[PDB]
Structure 1
């Protein structure tokens, strides 16, 4: 849906979008590519929201803290600037946009909150936060106010919270150790609430109210960033940009954002976007053109920053920037800001107490039990399991999960009751392996019987009974190409499969077709009773009732595509890895001889075959139905369907 041959750019409303559009017309005049710059409402959390119905922009502009969640969702393309370009930008800004080892955005400028005071109304600004209730007294009698800023966003509130000792995820890597309810956090927020209790400030004060109250000279001070400097100049109000006040003798620690430009992973114009950012924007001409509209702060470009650093206002921004901390780009930051936004608004409107509001936001920040998942792939031999499992291995590091292989003595697929109990205990209570992907040639094991809290997710892949047996036959004879060093068990057997069947051999007897059924039937006796009608039926019921998804070998690509859509925690990027990996067809059996029409015909006379086949076509028909209902075929490739349900008539209201 993103138009090719043009660039669409989304940048925040309060920034210099008119200035960026100037650089857009210089790119259009030079390359012929139309550049459209827009500033949609609420793009902090609603960039992939409304993009679930329509694919849009090529370049996205925001602070680097969001760009990690975008990256993990696969919404960004890994940018590739040459080292000649990386050396003209501050190395620390590149770290701000480095997620999982690779770069995901082009760092533009470094923004930070500073204290802005009215030179006329207040010659000497307060050094501390405590001398503001006393300062508001005299200004209230005149008809003014001591301070006015955005209380609806936790961005402006955080410097006071992190002042005395508040923090979010301690930087050791960062852990799930949130400190929004410690001494410093509670003390900082409580003082802010007492400023509204004593009516030194209004709890409904947003951005527009704050900006208007200052530019019209109704309030002495305000808190904002570089982007609000241009709007004060048009008011002729003499102001000054200084260092943030100190709470409890502690310097305020504002969160430092780095304005970054990332490239949409869906954008077809990734080459036009790369050229625009590197050659037209991230240059002295481009940055100055945007700076004329709304100040960017301290740019990441070495060249243009040497000239901006000679500014009394930029000096104050980089001062507060060093007092504060650069935000993490971890995906938890999206849930962090939401949690704090809620705690701040509630504490300010009296709808909740400071002690309780921060205690609630304490646990909304991380540890949402999204990490407590376990997949079991009880892989069936010679069904392309090696190729699939290696996707799990390649993604586990990046997608943050663990992959373990289960080994059983003499490869026996049935566990002893005591071993079943231990396995179940392990899978479920081995916290340090969650989320986890256990795999191995084990028969289906039912966790319900053992009274666990949470069952694991079962998936599998099966193959045509005869083609699997034949593949397995020649496998023991000749081995594979994944590990060609192992000498297989029945190596040194010359007879071919077709020759064996005709000779009534034991390795190619129909009874040897019975495997995929017991693998689903489980550790019950009747499952391994070869040719059991009960075993068949039970194997079907388990595949329907207990297996999350079971695909077929010969359609493994679609199987992986569906898992990436359903369980993206485990399989984000699995499809791309499969299509462009060279590790997609692992463990080919070295020397295979496909069976004669005559050989296949004789196997098909066996009831053991008729059943093992019936199960296959059952599991196949099922997969084909699952896919059919999950995708849409829009000329060529399949595309995963959007969300097709919603909730309505929700009472009581509210």
Structure 2
């Protein structure tokens, strides 16, 4: 079982665990309670196993979407922040950590795709998707293209498909309706049709994947790309003069990227729930706590309003948050696995003309509501 009188934390190795350890030393300094930060391999797979037998960490950090399944098995304790604490974070981040009306984690950081552009090839980035075909024509006249991004993964193409009314599952009051899916409505067909037109008209290649898009942008061959905070590091080494901005609108509607919220959940089997609540609310979720983590490895945009206002002095963070506020929180329900699979197939089939847009989306919708 889990030991009383200490805190064990699991967080992924690509996060600022040395910075989190420093927040834990301040907590120990104040309380005498020792905090241990670990970053085990495949911790998101291990957690459900060890937590099922009342073991594991007191606190686990992960993207909010995995927590729906954890909470389904009763592996997470319901949290109880007061209204005053809740107000210190962006309201939309709390929606990401509700499972069947219960708050099951604390929101830490927010991730969403943004439009990344080469300031040298483009003085001002396009504000709409519709003007991209013409812009590509101007740039092709000089051996460059307008836009290259990963078309193989629905995570990347979804912002455009959803822009005019598409949605994964309907959400109402901390709950999703698994029978109300917006994959084959008029808005989703409009968006995927637009995407297919870009491919037919040779403004983009259907086989463009993550590594192809990144290489082209970082080599200066394409004016724009669509990517998240994790990409900036390779661009910075490439020394391309880039900007990060709000995604283009489609049909006058904002692009709707999926929002991922890094969250901290408390093991239901933990005998240290009060200690975990004190650590999270009063040590980690402060400007000083988040700064310590961020200084180790940047979090991106954060759910804490006060610290986010300081971070947003960096335009790339500001844009990340702006796209997140216009985005679609990623559903934390198990049915999302049917969605990823079906939509990946629908997009690839419609892109290669194997199937028409109507038929590909019709099939996906059926398959997801099955």
Report the Cα distance in structure 2 between the residues aligned to 1:213 and 1:4, rounded to whole angstroms: 53
Q: Measure how far apart 1:238 and its partner are.
A: 1.9
The SS at the match of 1:174 is: strand
Describe the shift of the 1:61–1:215 C-alpha distance in structure 2 as closer, same or farther (beyond 3 A).
farther
Describe the shift of the 1:87–1:203 C-alpha distance in structure 2 as closer, same or farther (beyond 3 A).
same
Cα contact 2:88–2:304 (8 A) shared by 1: yes
Report the Cα distance in structure 2 between the residues aligned to 1:201 and 1:226, rounded to whole angstroms: 23
Cα contact 1:229–1:294 (8 A) shared by 2: no
Report the Cα distance in structure 1 between the residues aligned to 2:352 and 2:40, rounded to whole angstroms: 28
Unaligned stretches of 5+ in structure 2?
362-369
Q: How many residues align?
A: 359
Q: Measure how far apart 1:296 and its partner are.
A: 3.4
Q: Measure how far apart 1:6 and its partner are.
A: 6.5
The SS at the match of 2:262 is: strand
TM-score by length of 2: 0.77
Describe the shift of the 1:78–1:53 C-alpha distance in structure 2 as closer, same or farther (beyond 3 A).
closer
Structure showing greater relative contact order (alpha-carbon pairs closer than 8 Å, 6 or more residues apart): 2
Describe the shift of the 1:18–1:245 C-alpha distance in structure 2 as closer, same or farther (beyond 3 A).
farther
Cα contact 2:52–2:75 (8 A) shared by 1: no
Q: Measure how far apart 1:117 and its partner are.
A: 0.8
Q: Measure how far apart 1:146 and its partner are.
A: 2.5
Cα contact 2:50–2:56 (8 A) shared by 1: no
Cα contact 1:230–1:294 (8 A) shared by 2: no
Cα contact 1:161–1:184 (8 A) shared by 2: yes
The SS at the match of 1:306 is: helix
| Deviation by residue 1:154-194 (Cα, 9 ceiling, x = unmatched) | 22211101112212233457462111012221221233234
Q: Measure how far apart 1:202 and its partner are.
A: 4.4
Report the Cα distance in structure 2 between the residues aligned to 1:213 and 1:18, rounded to whole angstroms: 34
Q: Measure how far apart 1:60 and its partner are.
A: 3.1
TM-score by length of 1: 0.47
Q: Measure how far apart 1:287 and its partner are.
A: 1.0
Describe the shift of the 1:95–1:248 C-alpha distance in structure 2 as closer, same or farther (beyond 3 A).
closer
Cα contact 1:230–1:293 (8 A) shared by 2: no
Cα contact 1:45–1:334 (8 A) shared by 2: no
Describe the shift of the 1:348–1:27 C-alpha distance in structure 2 as closer, same or farther (beyond 3 A).
farther
Matched, 1:45 2:45: yes
Cα contact 2:118–2:241 (8 A) shared by 1: yes
Cα contact 1:163–1:250 (8 A) shared by 2: yes
Cα contact 1:69–1:334 (8 A) shared by 2: no
Report the Cα distance in structure 2 between the residues aligned to 1:304 and 1:331, rounded to whole angstroms: 33
Q: Measure how far apart 1:301 and its partner are.
A: 2.0
Report the Cα distance in structure 2 between the residues aligned to 1:196 and 1:95, rounded to whole angstroms: 36
Report the Cα distance in structure 2 between the residues aligned to 1:67 and 1:22, rounded to whole angstroms: 26
Report the Cα distance in structure 1 between the residues aligned to 2:56 and 2:165, rounded to whole angstroms: 41
| Deviation by residue 1:482-501 (Cα, 9 ceiling, x = unmatched) | xxxxxxxxxxxxxxxxxxxx
Describe the shift of the 1:68–1:185 C-alpha distance in structure 2 as closer, same or farther (beyond 3 A).
same
Report the Cα distance in structure 2 between the residues aligned to 1:46 and 1:202, rounded to whole angstroms: 39
Stretch moving more, 327-336 or 6-15: 6-15
Q: Measure how far apart 1:285 and its partner are.
A: 1.5
Q: Measure how far apart 1:45 and its partner are.
A: 8.0
| Deviation by residue 1:120-153 (Cα, 9 ceiling, x = unmatched) | 1221212222333343345456554432333343
Cα contact 1:149–1:223 (8 A) shared by 2: yes
Describe the shift of the 1:188–1:47 C-alpha distance in structure 2 as closer, same or farther (beyond 3 A).
farther
Q: Measure how far apart 1:78 and its partner are.
A: 1.6
Report the Cα distance in structure 2 between the residues aligned to 1:202 and 1:53, rounded to whole angstroms: 49
Cα contact 1:15–1:227 (8 A) shared by 2: no
Q: Measure how far apart 1:104 and its partner are.
A: 0.7
Q: Measure how far apart 1:322 and its partner are.
A: 3.7
Describe the shift of the 1:240–1:104 C-alpha distance in structure 2 as closer, same or farther (beyond 3 A).
same
Describe the shift of the 1:68–1:146 C-alpha distance in structure 2 as closer, same or farther (beyond 3 A).
same
Stretch moving more, 11-20 or 151-160: 11-20
Describe the shift of the 1:98–1:51 C-alpha distance in structure 2 as closer, same or farther (beyond 3 A).
closer
Cα contact 1:228–1:294 (8 A) shared by 2: no
Stretch moving more, 337-346 or 40-49: 40-49
> What is the root-mean-square deviation in Å for CA atoms of aligned residues?
4.1
| Deviation by residue 1:604-635 (Cα, 9 ceiling, x = unmatched) | xxxxxxxxxxxxxxxxxxxxxxxxxxxxxxxx
The SS at the match of 2:8 is: strand
Cα contact 1:4–1:269 (8 A) shared by 2: yes
Describe the shift of the 1:353–1:246 C-alpha distance in structure 2 as closer, same or farther (beyond 3 A).
same
Q: Measure how far apart 1:112 and its partner are.
A: 2.7
The SS at the match of 2:180 is: coil
Unaligned stretches of 5+ in structure 1?
359-653
| Deviation by residue 1:184-212 (Cα, 9 ceiling, x = unmatched) | 21221233234344554444544454444
Matched, 1:257 2:260: yes
Report the Cα distance in structure 2 between the residues aligned to 1:238 and 1:51, rounded to whole angstroms: 47
Q: Measure how far apart 1:106 and its partner are.
A: 0.6
Alignment-derived partner of residue 202 in structure 1 = 205
* Higher CA-based Rg: 1
The SS at the match of 2:238 is: coil
Q: Measure how far apart 1:101 and its partner are.
A: 3.5
The SS at the match of 1:346 is: helix
Cα contact 1:346–1:357 (8 A) shared by 2: yes
| Deviation by residue 1:356-397 (Cα, 9 ceiling, x = unmatched) | 332xxxxxxxxxxxxxxxxxxxxxxxxxxxxxxxxxxxxxxx
Cα contact 2:10–2:39 (8 A) shared by 1: yes
